[PDB]
Amino acid sequence: MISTKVTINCPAGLDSKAAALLVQKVSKYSSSIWLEKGERRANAKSLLGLLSLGVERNAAITIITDGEDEKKAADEISEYFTVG
């Protein structure tokens, strides 16, 4: 189980476009993947869960990965949220 803290460097945070792209990207991994904002939590495979987080631009978020590829998933999700 890996916890990595990141800043959402996305113009409208996790809006429809950014949440939908995360859901697509995250299907490539075998690991369970969740995002956490304070006490709000969502499975990264759930468009509805991601949207319900209400993540805005520059929000501090925790990426939680758990499974065979958990370190790869953690690095690539953090990269997606800082660089694009």
The three-point CA angle 73-67-74 to 5° equals 20
Distances (CA, A) of 13 to 23, 42, 45, 71, 84: 14, 15, 17, 23, 12
Degrees to nearest 5, angle at CA 55 with 52 and 58 = 180
Phi-psi region of 79 (alpha: psi -120 to 50; beta: other; left: phi over 0): alpha
CA 59-22-65 angle, to 5 degrees, is 80
> Could you give phi then psi for residue 3, rounded to 5 degrees?
-105, 120
Resolution in angstroms for this experimental structure?
A: 2.4
- In the three-class reduction of DSSP (H, G, I as helix; E, B as strand; rest coil), residue 84 is classed as coil
Cβ atoms of residues 30 and 69 within 8 Å: yes
